[PDB]
Design a protein around this ligand. Structure first.
Ligand SMILES: Cc1cnc(Cn2ccc3c(Cl)nc(N)nc32)c(C)c1Cl
Length: 208
């Protein structure tokens, strides 16, 4: 059921840089994940203009932010296009190679980790705050999958038997012990207002 894969060498190098570099401005991970959700919602919305049946798996286009203090997780949920098995295992890693190389060269010349999204690899900024990331996803053309990685240089993919999603992506951040501020209502609200106030989809910050 669970298959294990090696990241492309450039992606393992990027993840190590994100985990090892001293960089205090960790809060930017949330803007990067919300921007990915917004891009995924724009993609399904635009495809639905030529094929309305693409919304048979759910008409609502939104982003939810769900903290869970008991589990020490922050989850970013969207009803965007979702990812196929081929996206998870091959396509996302392949497309990211040029952007990863460009980003690592830009950092050597004076750029900052907060610019990661300009290189299309902002998802990996999740490792600024998470020791493990679990991604549940469902694309209209494929089955529901669970992707997972604690940065071994490896990740896993399995068909998911959990709560059916309809369509979209859930990024579950298993936070590092010293990063629990990202479970606080006031802190998430502050970050969303600072970096994500103009996103074109409703962002609901759940509370406990
Ligand atoms: C390996 C990897 C790379 N990039 C990403 C970021 N991404 C790529 C496609 C995609 C969609 Cl359709 N929705 C969301 N919200 N995020 C997405 C992930 C989620 C993984 Cl798992």
């Amino acid at each position: 059921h669970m298959e294990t894969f090696a990241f492309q060498a450039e992606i393992a190098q990027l993840m190590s840089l994100i985990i090892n570099t001293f960089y205090s401005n960790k809060e930017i991970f949330l803007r990067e994940l919300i921007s990915n959700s917004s891009d995924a919602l724009d993609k399904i919305r635009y495809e639905s203009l030529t094929d309305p049946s693409k919304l048979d798996s759910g008409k609502e286009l939104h982003i939810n932010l769900i903290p869970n203090k008991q589990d020490r997780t922050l989850t970013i949920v969207d009803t965007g296009i979702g990812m196929t098995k081929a996206d998870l295992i091959n396509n996302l890693g392949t497309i990211a190679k040029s952007g990863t190389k460009a980003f690592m060269e830009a950092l050597q010349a004076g750029a900052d980790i907060s610019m990661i999204g300009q290189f299309g690899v902002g998802f990996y900024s999740a490792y600024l705050v998470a020791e493990k990331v679990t991604v549940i996803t469902k694309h209209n053309d494929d089955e529901q999958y669970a992707w997972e990685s604690s940065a071994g240089g490896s990740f896993t993919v399995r068909t998911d038997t959990g709560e059916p999603m309809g369509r979209g992506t859930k990024v579950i951040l298993h936070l590092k012990e010293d990063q629990t501020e990202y479970l606080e209502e006031r802190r998430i609200k502050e970050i969303v207002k600072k970096h994500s106030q103009f996103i074109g989809y409703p962002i609901t910050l759940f509370v406990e």
